[PDB]
Design a protein around this ligand. Structure first.
Ligand SMILES: CCc1oc2cc(S(=O)(=O)N(C)C)ccc2c1C(=O)c1cc(Br)c(O)c(Br)c1
Length: 292
């Protein structure tokens, strides 16, 4: 399998770090002037992680439309994602205003609220049906409707209400809960399963706004999700699946948001996910059926 073979060549030569550095060097650099405005200081989790001005998402509110989020538009694959940082105590209302204004169906969360004894993002969703959340600054209501805790992830149904208009929508929260505190997963099996669970839900589909993907910084684990998904999608769209080059797909995603894939291990893991994902697609995690 084309890339598989390259994969193995990089392993033999032990050059993941060198491959990864080439990407860091070749990546786009665009300005992030709005992100750096003194007034957005508390809207950014990390100083070194900002959205480029050209692909940033804008809040449809007057005066301060800023949120640390980017639209990654994959023209060939026909997929769009909004990669964002994990909400802060002060940006949960902005986070949901965005979900609302962008017409997203799903939110993909790839971290735990606490990891390594530290807080990785705010608790931005209700944990109990009877205890709903209200975000006064953006005038929105959010209710946990149902929760389905599984082995490697938890899916939640939430109801988001725009208090101004009393309009409501169902939002699906797909929460991968098993990313290990250090390094990356040993096998992609579970991440691939989770990705395909997200697809199944319609959250990545054209009839809805872009999916909202986040981790803590919104470039590491988050990059892996979008990169893996796009690559797989391209492999069954093209006449020559082997022609799909991950490094080049990654460089294209980085035109829209900086840092996607933060370590050589994340890179190696992404290859793995695509390779094993393609191999699954070409023959238990799913029904032997072919009803469709
Ligand atoms: C293509 C998606 C996928 O790829 C996998 C690869 C493995 S593996 O790496 O463990 N393997 C070598 C079979 C396991 C499970 C999966 C896996 C799935 O779990 C999965 C889930 C759903 Br829902 C699907 O519709 C499909 Br197709 C596949």
């Amino acid at each position: 399998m084309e890339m598989e073979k390259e994969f193995e060549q990089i392993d033999k030569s032990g050059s993941w770090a060198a491959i990864y550095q080439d990407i860091r060097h070749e990546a786009s650099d665009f300005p992030c002037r709005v992100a750096k405005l003194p007034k957005n200081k508390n809207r950014n989790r990390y100083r070194d992680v900002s959205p480029f001005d050209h692909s940033r998402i804008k809040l449809h509110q007057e005066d301060n439309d800023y949120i640390n989020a980017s639209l990654i538009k994959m023209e060939e694959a026909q997929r769009s994602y909004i990669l964002t940082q994990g909400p802060l105590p002060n940006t949960c209302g902005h986070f949901w205003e965005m979900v609302w204004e962008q017409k997203s169906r799903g939110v993909v969360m790839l971290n735990r609220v606490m990891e390594k004894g530290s807080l990785k993002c705010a608790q931005y969703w209700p944990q109990k049906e009877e205890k709903e959340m209200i975000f006064e600054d953006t005038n929105l209501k959010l209710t946990l409707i149902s929760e389905d805790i599984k082995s490697y992830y938890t899916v939640r149904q939430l109801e988001l209400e725009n208090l101004t208009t009393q309009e409501t929508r169902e939002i699906l929260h797909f929460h991968y809960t098993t990313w290990p505190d250090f390094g990356v997963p040993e096998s992609p099996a579970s991440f691939l399963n989770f990705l395909f669970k997200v697809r199944e839900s319609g959250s990545l589909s054209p009839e809805h706004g872009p999916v909202v993907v986040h981790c803590s910084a919104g470039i590491g684990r988050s990059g892996t999700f979008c990169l893996a998904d796009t690559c797989l999608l391209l492999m069954d769209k093209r006449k020559d699946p082997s022609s799909v080059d991950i490094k080049k797909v990654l460089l294209e995603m980085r035109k829209f948001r900086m840092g996607l894939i933060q370590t050589a291990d994340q890179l190696r893991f992404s290859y793995l996910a695509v390779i094993e994902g393609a191999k699954f697609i070409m023959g238990q995690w799913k029904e032997l059926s072919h009803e469709d």
